[PDB]
Amino acid sequence: GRASQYVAPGTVSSMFSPAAYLTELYREARNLHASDSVYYLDTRRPDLK
């Protein structure tokens, strides 16, 4: 039913919301460093995931 559910700007659920932006940044940024590195995103900030 996703195409039947449209939302207003300003909601976290919108595909154009900053949450969507954040999701995409995380999705890609997390692979910039190896999982065993001190520079690994989830090591640096476990609260992010």
Added chain:
Amino acid sequence: YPVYQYSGNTSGLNQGRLLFHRDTTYPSKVEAWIPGAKRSLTNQNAAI
């Protein structure tokens, strides 16, 4: 926006069909009550 189609007349149908267009995009069971027949035709989770 209903239309009733009768069986036969070059297209065999089981009895016939009550065709309709709906603009509701939510799933729903559509019911067509016929008060003078005390009959009701339905379609569960009718298509968009």
